[PDB]
RNA sequence: AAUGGGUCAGCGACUUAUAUUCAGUGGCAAGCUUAACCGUAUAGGGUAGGCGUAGCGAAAGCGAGUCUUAAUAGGGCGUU
RNA sequence: AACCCACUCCCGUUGAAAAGGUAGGGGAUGACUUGUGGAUCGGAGUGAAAGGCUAAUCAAGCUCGGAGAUAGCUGGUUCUC
RNA sequence: UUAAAAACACAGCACUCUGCAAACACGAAAGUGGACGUAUAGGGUGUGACGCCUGCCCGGUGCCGGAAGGUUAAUUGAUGG
RNA sequence: UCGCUGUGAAGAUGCAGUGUAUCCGCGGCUAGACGGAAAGACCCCGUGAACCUUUACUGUAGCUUUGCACUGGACUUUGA
RNA sequence: CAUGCUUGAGGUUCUAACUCUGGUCCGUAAUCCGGAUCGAGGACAGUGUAUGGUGGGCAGUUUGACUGGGGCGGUCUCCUCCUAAAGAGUAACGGAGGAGUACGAAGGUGCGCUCAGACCGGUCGGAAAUCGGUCGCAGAGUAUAAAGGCAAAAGCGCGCUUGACUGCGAGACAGACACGUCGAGCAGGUACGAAAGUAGGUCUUAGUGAUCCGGUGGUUCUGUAUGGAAGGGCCAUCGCU
């Protein structure tokens, strides 16, 4: 089933966001762009540890 | 004697000039699943409904 | 508080805040009640003297209510921007 | 018996009539689908809900081909 | 054809204390009122305290405003 | 036979009696019956064991206290327009 | 004080515990019984004169013996933050 | 303080219709007065109670393991 | 390796602590109790305190509701249709079915395109593969039940991509409450497209669990003499068949 991850932000800041994925069928990251409020601007997210 | 206050009640029921402060529910945990909008208007600070502050403020022994 | 069974208010909802210990020190004094010291000196002490404030109060702060009659002159306390001006603006220092 | 299952009632349908005066963000129509389609000055929501976004008065004509149900909004 | 009563006389069930809220009726009024306690003792004194004259915020705090927010934008609560 | 017991019928059941009587019945030198004095008791005693007995009371005596226990249950609640 | 029996006891049988300051029981403890006894004795358990007999199962749950290894308390306090 | 047939909280001395019938005892019998007696013991309910059981839960007397104390000397084996 | 001063455990021994419900003396006229002295055991036993095991011997309690009486059986939350009487709502241990997920593309956008089936013709297949033609128009498809929808296709393919954004929010629908649903518009930063524009997930309606308590990341808050810190608050998030 899919479990939980979080999406940290590249910049300095210690925003970040939440989601889930299937860990078996797709076992590589997640490098997705997404706007950071702290920074105000768009800049790149990577998959971390929920817990 | 003194009439006693619930002491829960006073922790989550805040006297103002516009009526009494709560908070909401819903927003302890399980936040993965739920809507950014859901999240951002369970947020702040409400009144109490007009049927429920009769229970209230007895239980503060505010009547 | 009970309700015939139901989860009730007073355990359905978050508890939430802190209380804060420093703001027991502390009290506001309208401008309509300056004209009511003994004489031209606002302080801690002659407030005290009038029964304007309690006995266990160190910090006093003046907001704009009312307008102010004579000329006085506060002494350790604070005032709003308001009211700062409504008290000079009426022949009235603000010193120390 | 192994049959006693129902869901709750999601009380849809028309919520204002025609001739009926509206003002913007009204909810006009609660559906599934869309049997009604949006006319003028109305939005459609991503649970097919038609929604003023203009003041007026509603008018349900049928019209074009497909004989499809449309609901506009018009002048007072 | 459900319960109670053989009859008479006597007795027999919404009270009191302390904290409060609303209404009626009074005293003072941007002020009102004292508690223990003194007392020439139901007088008079005693204004420590309580409530009101300002609110918003979890708070620091700021204040006819304040909180949220990057935002004198919007919105919540409050102000004649 | 006395004495100890209590198997059957009937009577009695507001009784002569809050467990009897008449007529029959069992043991009757024994693991017998009985007088006087003494010991063990309330979650305790004693019991050839029936949950029996512990002052006509026993799946936990009686008495006085906590005590006006608690009773979402029955019953009752008094003059007039 | 509605059940006298096929129920309880019983003589006999078996298992098991106990080396004496015995096991065991009543006692906050001192002590007392067991017993002024001593394994042919004392306690518990089942069966129930006598005759002929009492078959198979040690996987479960108890009890008894073993000590190599694994897990394991208070205690101690290396190391790191 | 009658019978019958209906009606009716659904089995009537008391209601409807109808039939019978002067007033009051005594000796007898028990068909009815849902006769008297005991706030049903069967059954269900109460967020009732007792007592009993066990590999229900949470504990506990007793029994038992080890550290420290009361608690010492010597020799030897042995790890640090 | 030798010795030295320590130090965990093991075994043996000694006597002086302790123990004796062993003897004989005294208090004494006494099978109690003390003191003395012989004998035996001996740092063991035993008691205090801390700790693991066992422990219905004993104790305080728990052991749901609905229900054509209770029990047994079944059910208890959510979605779709009928009952349901052409607005909404509407009961039964009434009649029928599903859910406790999936997807980093199965989302956004630009561009482009239409199915199932039938017949005829055509190498091994032959009713059914791939190819050509005509008819057909939705009798296909839609991640997942059923209902309502689907040509600006909401169905299918390709390129670029992260709007499955952050703060809000006029106004509504539902509604005992707590919860729930839809949303134009504004401000920041984006993505596609020449552009008007579209985008705050998926054709829609199921895929879920309050508070307390504890954990993790931030923080213009607080921080019991003072400066810190611990702890608390606020924001984000995790742990319930
Ligand atoms: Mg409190
Ligand atoms: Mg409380
Ligand atoms: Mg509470
Ligand atoms: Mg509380
Ligand atoms: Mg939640
Ligand atoms: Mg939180
Ligand atoms: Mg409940
Ligand atoms: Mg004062
Ligand atoms: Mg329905
Ligand atoms: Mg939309
Ligand atoms: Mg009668
Ligand atoms: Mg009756
Ligand atoms: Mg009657
Ligand atoms: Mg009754
Ligand atoms: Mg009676
Ligand atoms: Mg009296
Ligand atoms: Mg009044
Ligand atoms: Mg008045
Ligand atoms: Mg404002
Ligand atoms: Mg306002
Ligand atoms: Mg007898
Ligand atoms: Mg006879
Ligand atoms: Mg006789
Ligand atoms: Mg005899
Ligand atoms: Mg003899
Ligand atoms: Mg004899
Ligand atoms: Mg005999
Ligand atoms: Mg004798
Ligand atoms: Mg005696
Ligand atoms: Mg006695
Ligand atoms: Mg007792
Ligand atoms: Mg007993
Ligand atoms: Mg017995
Ligand atoms: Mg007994
Ligand atoms: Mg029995
Ligand atoms: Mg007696
Ligand atoms: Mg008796
Ligand atoms: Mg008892
Ligand atoms: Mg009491
Ligand atoms: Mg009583
Ligand atoms: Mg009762
Ligand atoms: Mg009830
Ligand atoms: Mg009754
Ligand atoms: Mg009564
Ligand atoms: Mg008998
Ligand atoms: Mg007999
Ligand atoms: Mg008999
Ligand atoms: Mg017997
Ligand atoms: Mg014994
Ligand atoms: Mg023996
Ligand atoms: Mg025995
Ligand atoms: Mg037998
Ligand atoms: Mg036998
Ligand atoms: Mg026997
Ligand atoms: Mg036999
Ligand atoms: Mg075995
Ligand atoms: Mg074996
Ligand atoms: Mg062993
Ligand atoms: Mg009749
Ligand atoms: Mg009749
Ligand atoms: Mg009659
Ligand atoms: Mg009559
Ligand atoms: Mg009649
Ligand atoms: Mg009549
Ligand atoms: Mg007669
Ligand atoms: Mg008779
Ligand atoms: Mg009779
Ligand atoms: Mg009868
Ligand atoms: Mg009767
Ligand atoms: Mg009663
Ligand atoms: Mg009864
Ligand atoms: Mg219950
Ligand atoms: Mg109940
Ligand atoms: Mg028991
Ligand atoms: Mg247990
Ligand atoms: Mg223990
Ligand atoms: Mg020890
Ligand atoms: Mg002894
Ligand atoms: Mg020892
Ligand atoms: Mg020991
Ligand atoms: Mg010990
Ligand atoms: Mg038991
Ligand atoms: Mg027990
Ligand atoms: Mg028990
Ligand atoms: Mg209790
Ligand atoms: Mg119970
Ligand atoms: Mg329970
Ligand atoms: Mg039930
Ligand atoms: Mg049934
Ligand atoms: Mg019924
Ligand atoms: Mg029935
Ligand atoms: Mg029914
Ligand atoms: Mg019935
Ligand atoms: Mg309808
Ligand atoms: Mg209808
Ligand atoms: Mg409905
Ligand atoms: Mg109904
Ligand atoms: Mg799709
Ligand atoms: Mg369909
Ligand atoms: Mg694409
Ligand atoms: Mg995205
Ligand atoms: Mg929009
Ligand atoms: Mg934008
Ligand atoms: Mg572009
Ligand atoms: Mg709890
Ligand atoms: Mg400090
Ligand atoms: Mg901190
Ligand atoms: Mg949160």
Same mark, same amino acid.
């Given at each position: 089933m899919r479990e939980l991850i979080r999406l940290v932000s590249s910049a300095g800041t210690?925003?970040? &966001?939440?989601?889930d994925k299937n860990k078996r069928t797709k076992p590589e990251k997640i490098e997705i762009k997404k &706007? /950071?409020? $702290?920074?105000?601007q768009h800049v790149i997210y990577k998959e971390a540890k929920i817990k | 004697p003194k009439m006693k206050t619930k002491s829960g009640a006073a922790k989550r029921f805040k006297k103002t000039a516009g009526?009494?402060?709560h908070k909401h529910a819903f927003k302890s945990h399980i936040l993965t699943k739920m809507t950014t909008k859901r999240? %951002?208007?369970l947020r702040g600070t409400s009144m109490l409904?007009?049927? /429920?502050? @009769? %229970? $209230?403020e007895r239980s503060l022994r505010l009547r | 508080g009970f309700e015939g069974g139901q989860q009730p208010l007073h355990r359905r909802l978050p508890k939430f805040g802190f209380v804060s210990l420093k703001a027991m020190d502390r009290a506001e004094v309208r401008t309509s009640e300056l004209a009511k010291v003994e004489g031209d000196v606002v302080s801690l002490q002659t407030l005290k003297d009038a029964n304007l404030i309690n006995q266990h $109060?160190? %910090? $006093?702060k003046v907001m704009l209510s009312g307008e102010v009659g004579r000329a006085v002159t506060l002494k350790g306390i @604070? @005032?709003?921007?308001?009211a700062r001006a409504a008290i000079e603006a009426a022949g009235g220092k603000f010193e120390d | 018996t192994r049959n006693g299952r129902d869901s709750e009632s999601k009380r849809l349908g028309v919520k204002l009539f025609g001739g009926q005066a509206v003002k913007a963000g009204n909810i006009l129509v609660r559906q599934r689908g869309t049997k009604f389609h949006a006319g003028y000055g109305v939005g459609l929501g991503k649970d097919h809900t038609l929604f003023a976004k203009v003041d007026g008065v509603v008018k349900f004509e049928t019209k074009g081909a497909f004989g499809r149900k449309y609901v506009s909004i018009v002048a007072a």
């Open positions: 210690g925003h970040f &966001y939440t989601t &706007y /950071d409020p $702290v920074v105000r | 009526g009494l402060k999240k %951002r208007q409904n007009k049927s /429920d502050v @009769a %229970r $209230v | $109060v160190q %910090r $006093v @604070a @005032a709003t921007k308001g | -």
